[PDB]
């Protein structure tokens, strides 16, 4: 029973880590949005001249 | 290129394009840092032997080893043998008296 | 609160229950009559103790 308990605890730790990874991927995508927005702003500035 | 603009030498579009380039480079560096921060959540534990994945397999190794060590049946009590219904070659389960 | 953590927690709770049930408890204030369990015995959820 102790062996099974330890196995379950390891599984819980792994799941927590994967969820944290997804939350970080969100920030990565936000940065990508920022770069695309900068590109759009430049292309808009050029046209108005 | 900044100081020339203060003296009105180069076009304004050239400075605009320089600032835009700097901002884009900053954004890209942020993307890289974030890519690094992910995949660092998996390697939080300092030591390789303490990582969650390795310990799971260690548990299975332990279960198998206990299974192998139990092929030798040990007496739990001091005493004397009375009945013997076990012979070489018998097929035994955990429900057969010995 | 993310689903993966919840599922792992369920798995850990089941393991903990299985481990804690290694102590048999008497649901009654009575007297012991027909003992049939001896140390070293291999028992199952159907064996009378």
From Swiss-Prot, chain C:
Subcellular localization: Cell inner membrane
Protein family per UniProt: Belongs to the membrane fusion protein (MFP) (TC 8.A.1) family.
Subunit annotation: Homodimer and homotrimer. Part of the tripartite efflux system EmrAB-TolC, which is composed of an inner membrane transporter, EmrB, a periplasmic membrane fusion protein, EmrA, and an outer membrane component, TolC. The complex forms a large protein conduit and can translocate molecules across both the inner and outer membranes. Interacts with EmrB. EmrAB complex forms a dimer in vitro.
Job description of the protein: Part of the tripartite efflux system EmrAB-TolC, which confers resistance to antibiotics such as CCCP, FCCP, 2,4-dinitrophenol and nalidixic acid. EmrA is a drug-binding protein that provides a physical link between EmrB and TolC.
UniProt-recorded name of the protein: Multidrug export protein EmrA
Residues of the full protein shown: 195 to 243 of 390
């Amino acid at each position: 029973a102790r062996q099974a308990f330890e196995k379950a605890k390891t599984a819980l730790a792994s799941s927590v880590r994967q969820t944290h990874q997804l939350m970080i991927n969100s920030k990565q995508l936000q940065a990508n949005i920022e770069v695309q927005k900068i590109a759009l702003a430049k292309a808009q500035s050029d046209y108005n001249r | 290129r900044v100081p020339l603009g203060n003296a009105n030498l180069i076009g304004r579009e050239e400075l605009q394009h320089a600032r835009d380039a700097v901002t884009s480079a900053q954004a890209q560096l942020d993307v890289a840092i974030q890519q690094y921060n992910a995949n660092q959540a998996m390697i939080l534990g300092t030591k390789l032997e303490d990582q969650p994945a390795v310990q799971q397999a260690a548990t299975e190794v332990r279960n198998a080893w206990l299974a192998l060590e139990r092929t030798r049946i040990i007496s739990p009590m001091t005493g004397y043998v009375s009945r013997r219904a076990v012979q070489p070659g018998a097929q035994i389960s955990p429900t057969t008296p010995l």
